[PDB]
Design an enzyme around this catalytic site. Sequence first.
Site, mmCIF file in Angstrom:
data_model
loop_
_atom_site.group_PDB
_atom_site.id
_atom_site.type_symbol
_atom_site.label_atom_id
_atom_site.label_comp_id
_atom_site.label_asym_id
_atom_site.label_seq_id
_atom_site.Cartn_x
_atom_site.Cartn_y
_atom_site.Cartn_z
ATOM 1 N N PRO A 323 -36.568 65.659 -0.350
ATOM 2 C CA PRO A 323 -37.990 65.274 -0.371
ATOM 3 C C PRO A 323 -38.273 64.172 -1.380
ATOM 4 O O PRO A 323 -37.909 64.272 -2.553
ATOM 5 C CB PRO A 323 -38.703 66.577 -0.749
ATOM 6 C CG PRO A 323 -37.677 67.374 -1.476
ATOM 7 C CD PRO A 323 -36.359 67.028 -0.855
ATOM 8 N N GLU A 352 -45.403 65.629 -2.164
ATOM 9 C CA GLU A 352 -45.037 64.282 -1.749
ATOM 10 C C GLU A 352 -46.187 63.545 -1.071
ATOM 11 O O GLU A 352 -46.318 62.325 -1.243
ATOM 12 C CB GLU A 352 -43.832 64.354 -0.804
ATOM 13 C CG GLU A 352 -42.523 64.846 -1.439
ATOM 14 C CD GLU A 352 -42.069 64.035 -2.640
ATOM 15 O OE1 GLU A 352 -42.512 62.877 -2.790
ATOM 16 O OE2 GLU A 352 -41.262 64.560 -3.437
ATOM 17 N N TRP A 454 -27.723 70.876 -31.877
ATOM 18 C CA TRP A 454 -28.132 71.362 -30.566
ATOM 19 C C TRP A 454 -28.078 72.882 -30.507
ATOM 20 O O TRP A 454 -29.010 73.526 -30.003
ATOM 21 C CB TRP A 454 -27.246 70.770 -29.472
ATOM 22 C CG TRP A 454 -27.682 71.204 -28.113
ATOM 23 C CD1 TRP A 454 -26.979 71.963 -27.232
ATOM 24 C CD2 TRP A 454 -28.941 70.932 -27.493
ATOM 25 N NE1 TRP A 454 -27.713 72.169 -26.090
ATOM 26 C CE2 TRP A 454 -28.925 71.545 -26.226
ATOM 27 C CE3 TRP A 454 -30.082 70.226 -27.887
ATOM 28 C CZ2 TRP A 454 -29.999 71.466 -25.347
ATOM 29 C CZ3 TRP A 454 -31.143 70.154 -27.019
ATOM 30 C CH2 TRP A 454 -31.099 70.773 -25.762
ATOM 31 N N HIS A 482 -29.826 64.048 -16.344
ATOM 32 C CA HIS A 482 -30.690 63.116 -17.044
ATOM 33 C C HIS A 482 -30.236 62.824 -18.471
ATOM 34 O O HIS A 482 -30.721 61.851 -19.059
ATOM 35 C CB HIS A 482 -32.104 63.666 -17.011
ATOM 36 C CG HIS A 482 -32.686 63.745 -15.635
ATOM 37 N ND1 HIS A 482 -32.784 62.646 -14.810
ATOM 38 C CD2 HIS A 482 -33.201 64.785 -14.939
ATOM 39 C CE1 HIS A 482 -33.335 63.004 -13.665
ATOM 40 N NE2 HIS A 482 -33.598 64.298 -13.718
#
EC number: 3.4.17.23
Lengths: 591, 587, 50, 50
Positions: A323, A352, A454, A482
């Site tokens: 999508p 969308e 972290w 990402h």
Amino acid sequence: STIEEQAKTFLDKFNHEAEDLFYQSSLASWNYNTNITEENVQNMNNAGDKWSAFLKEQSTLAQMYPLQEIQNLTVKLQLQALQQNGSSVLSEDKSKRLNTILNTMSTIYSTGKVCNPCLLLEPGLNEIMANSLDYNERLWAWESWRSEVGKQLRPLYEEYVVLKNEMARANHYEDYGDYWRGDYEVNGVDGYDYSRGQLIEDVEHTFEEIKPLYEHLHAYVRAKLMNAYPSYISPIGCLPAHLLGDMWGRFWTNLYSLTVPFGQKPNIDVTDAMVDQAWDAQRIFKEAEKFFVSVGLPNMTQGFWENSMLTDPGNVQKAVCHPTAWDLGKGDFRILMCTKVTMDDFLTAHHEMGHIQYDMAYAAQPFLLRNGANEGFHEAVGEIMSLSAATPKHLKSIGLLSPDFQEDNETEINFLLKQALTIVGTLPFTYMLEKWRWMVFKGEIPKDQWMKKWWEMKREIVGVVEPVPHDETYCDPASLFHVSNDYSFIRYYTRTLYQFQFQEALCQAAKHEGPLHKCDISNSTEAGQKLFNMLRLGKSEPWTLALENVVGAKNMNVRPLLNYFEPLFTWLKDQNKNSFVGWSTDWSPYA
Amino acid sequence: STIEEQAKTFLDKFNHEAEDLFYQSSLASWNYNTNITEENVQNMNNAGDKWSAFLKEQSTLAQMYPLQEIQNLTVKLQLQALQQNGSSVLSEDKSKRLNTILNTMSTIYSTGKVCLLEPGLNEIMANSLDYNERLWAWESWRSEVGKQLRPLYEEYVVLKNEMARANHYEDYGDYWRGDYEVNGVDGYDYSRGQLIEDVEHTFEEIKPLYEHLHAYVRAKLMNAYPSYISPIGCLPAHLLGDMWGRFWTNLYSLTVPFGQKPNIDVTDAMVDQAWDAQRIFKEAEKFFVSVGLPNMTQGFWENSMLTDPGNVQKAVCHPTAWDLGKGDFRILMCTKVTMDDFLTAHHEMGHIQYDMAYAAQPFLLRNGANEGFHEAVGEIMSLSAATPKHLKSIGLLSPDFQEDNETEINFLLKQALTIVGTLPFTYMLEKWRWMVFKGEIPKDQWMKKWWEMKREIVGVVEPVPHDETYCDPASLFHVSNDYSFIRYYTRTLYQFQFQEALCQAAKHEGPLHKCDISNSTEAGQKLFNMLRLGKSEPWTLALENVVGAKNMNVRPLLNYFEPLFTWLKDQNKNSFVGWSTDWSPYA
Amino acid sequence: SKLKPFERDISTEIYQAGNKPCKGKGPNCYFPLESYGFRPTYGVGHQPYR
Amino acid sequence: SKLKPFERDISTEIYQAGNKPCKGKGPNCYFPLESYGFRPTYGVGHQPYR
Ligand SMILES: *[C@@H]1O[C@H](CO)[C@@H](O[C@@H]2O[C@H](CO)[C@@H](O)[C@H](O)[C@H]2NC(C)=O)[C@H](O)[C@H]1NC(C)=O
Ligand SMILES: *[C@@H]1O[C@H](CO)[C@@H](O)[C@H](O)[C@H]1NC(C)=O
Ligand SMILES: *[C@@H]1O[C@H](CO)[C@@H](O)[C@H](O)[C@H]1NC(C)=O
Ligand SMILES: *[C@@H]1O[C@H](CO)[C@@H](O)[C@H](O)[C@H]1NC(C)=O
Ligand SMILES: *[C@@H]1O[C@H](CO)[C@@H](O)[C@H](O)[C@H]1NC(C)=O
Ligand SMILES: *[C@@H]1O[C@H](CO)[C@@H](O)[C@H](O)[C@H]1NC(C)=O
Ligand SMILES: *[C@@H]1O[C@H](CO)[C@@H](O)[C@H](O)[C@H]1NC(C)=O
């Protein structure tokens, strides 16, 4: 013949050529994803390189029209969008290496696999962890990924951070994290400027305001997972990282099946109604169209229906399908979907299509400013369409949800828990990740300590402890697409706050009462016009002002977050009064 | 969503509610002072608390519209008028003690006496030349009142300073300057320190001729008290006929330049004419209308009470102008057929006329530009009416009356004892109060600094300096209470600067007390337009427009008294000139 | 400048945006005319009309 | 907004001075109408007229 008049002539020419050249690129990209061929790759590559060369040349010409001499403001802003040097200042060898390392990090992430007790992490191993009931397999999966892939991404991640910082200095920023923060700056406004530092401070203050819901939600999640695995998880200690069911730590959707308030209570799912009613997937799309007309937004163009390809390519065209909403330029709007007769596809269709309601309104502005107010608005408004799609009022009035349905507060709690766990559980993760990336780009933390930091941030901020200690060679954040790629995570947090602030602003225009998750935006044409007044502005107006005209505030508030989940927050408090609240950061499977 | 638009809507609401509550408060207060009874006290207190409660709520709301975002200076100033917290910023226990102290200090003032205090103590000193009787009365009163006043005065000063600090002022003296400095405007801003220094410089510029008056008066006291007055040192304060030191006017009967030259007067004409309170004011109205100032309407005439009603409905006989709002203007006075009442009618009419002019603006701006301008305008019309040319024009002065310079000298001396004698004293007192609020002087030294500066600035000292136990300055009504004395000195100059412009409009060549500024309709109309400015246009611009300078103007005061200073110069050749601080009457 | 009623200006001279004399195309020198992109996939407001 | 010739308006709808709805009166919620308050002692421009 001064800077403002020449700038006006230059940008008008740029907008005409930009529409035609981007369109050629956007067509090549659509056609390629629709039908994967060698020719379509050449069309994508040729249109992309020609358009990029065009953008670089026009940016260079933009530099001869100084921003500080222009009194028009509209072209000033368009030039600010165009003036950023990007790669033109960075040394040629550093630019070539930066592009090479980004492509390498993406390639390793998407091609490196974790060999079974070999499988790609995204989506394979994450799906197994999400569906598996054995925490030892999730623990193994985390260690195996670090052993097999993390060692491949770490040394390149460190070089990537340095190369991006070098570009950031070339662009006159302290680091690349600051460069990303710069996407939220405005100027030339009546007290609407936000600094990068203020953006960070606003996030931290907002989290201090959010925390009561996060802690009551977390205490519930932690205790339920403890009851699921009481021989491993401490009643006081925080949760182990592998238990999340999401190697990235972003999605807490994989804990829901273990934290269900009542095993016997359903969530709202109208898939069976669509199938029993024999509705086509394109009909649930048409019903979403009817919703948009009812809100008071512009109707969908015939060009969308003829140009869009909503069904799965199947086995006819070799294709990549997911999508997504497209704006190809010059009024050409379309959506690519693998549509199915199911509730998940319905909410996605609303997401969308809403993105196209925005692209249709953005078309009123020049191409270079033909975007949203900020990076997080597009998804946040799609989520606004999703939230109204999810409420039972919407589904019942259309007929997707049974006409004899009545609200059941425990069912509303089950829905709200699943939604808060996905939407809220990710919030402190997104924050610690953006902040970690920022400190990493800044260079304040030595490269070796980064892994400590972290681990400590996971434990301190979200109550997540890595079950296995790791060395510098392994890199945990690199497990997310990402992180290995070039992506700013501030926008997911910002999108969600925009999303809840919007639901409240439109609820107030709609004049609905009750819990904010109960409140809808269907019909409510006052909310339609109120929303339409910002959609038409997009990137051309200050984003802080663009939101201000709708939300009525100088900045974003948490309050709509608590209002959405108010019955959930109350329920969680009632159970948390007996359970332990908070978490110990000293407990660790390692220890 | 714009701060200015929301501020305007807020201020319009405010002005309506403020005007209605203002009327309720002023009317109830009028009724009490007009008719003294418990019922009017009850209405006075309830209406006053209601009005103040309204203003505190409106200040709280005004603070939500920042001043820097307002483009309309009228709106910005109105917001500034409401944003000041005043008494609401000080902590509740400090406020409770502060109010207890103010009420206690007032009670002590009225409780003390010369072993009743008012008016008898000043009558005793003013009406007797026996050195020892004036001395006894001075010491006897201060010995009773200052012991209880000192501790409370000192605590009052500290608590007010805390209030001022909470309001972003250095001290309460600075707070007062904050109230006198111009705000709500851009490019006309003045510093509080500059206002203070401008007043001090003005004082120093006027002082050199005041020393000539001081030498003359000291010589006259020498004639009255050959064994007690040093030609070089300080003069006894108790010989002024004013326990407070405010005036040198009760020396006039001793200091008359030309005993054979009576002052110019028309009282005999009002007595033969038998002008009543309403005709004294209506004849003054004829003068005011001819000047160009606005006419007093019929409502005022029927609503006002300019006479003593008697014991059945006893009035408070203190001449005052009242502004009730919504067109309701009144003056409460108990008028007698005298020169003091004639001039008083002119003072209060001009005062209320200022109020009448400012009522055209928004409520927050229905205030004068400066507290000193209301009295200055009154005083100007009083002086104009006093001018012999006016008295001749109205026809009350005998048709064959002939003025000369020596009679004007006698007039000017009375005026000098009133103005020249009071200005260094009031100036000194305001500076002394500034040092106590500022905190420059330790509390145990406040009286010592008074003594020292009294010797240097005023030149008339206590016959015996007081002990640190006693606070003699606080025995004065306006020191015990919350009052800034800068407005008296500056009001005098405000009056002289306005008088200068009115005289220039008259275009008469001669001293300022001689020129007739009666009629000259354009000059009165211009002064009226200055009155209309209220707080809308700062008082500093009204003064600049009259004299062409932001600074206070020394020249019109000295030009007014110049024939008198010339007389004093002729007398100063024989007297010693200047004050020594080494000798005092005690020593 | 703007055209007069029924005026048909068919000039192909390059317009220079600045003061610097310019011949042909360049950084601040542009052809007065631009083409329209007409495709069967463009939206209603972008499609060609007779 | 302002009235048209011979237009009469009898609404008392509360005006919201900000960007949000408001129920009743408040810090920036203004009731459009104000009452009169007439007293026999008022001036010519303040007295009631028929
Ligand atoms: C928005 O308003 C429309 C009417 O303008 C609603 O449509 C009706 O919905 C009911 C639901 O039972 C149907 O029985 C009616 O036949 C519908 N009317 C039409 C003309 O189609 C719509 O349901 C409203 N939206 C919501 C969420 O209630
Ligand atoms: C980078 O951008 C600045 C404008 O901020 C410009 O002056 C400079 O020449 C640019 N450098 C390059 C190499 O494009
Ligand atoms: C919106 O578009 C659809 C397209 O099929 C059409 O059926 C519908 O009537 C339109 N509604 C309006 C209000 O234009
Ligand atoms: C995919 O594109 C190629 C090249 O244009 C074409 O020959 C082929 O038929 C297309 N496939 C389908 C299923 O249309
Ligand atoms: C739902 O309502 C019932 C009463 O009908 C109450 O007993 C129950 O606790 C409620 N549950 C929640 C989650 O509010
Ligand atoms: C004056 O006071 C007396 C008190 O005895 C009261 O009865 C009378 O009504 C008052 N008059 C006015 C006008 O207030
Ligand atoms: C008043 O004027 C006369 C005119 O001859 C003059 O002799 C006298 O000295 C003057 N007096 C004063 C005090 O100036």
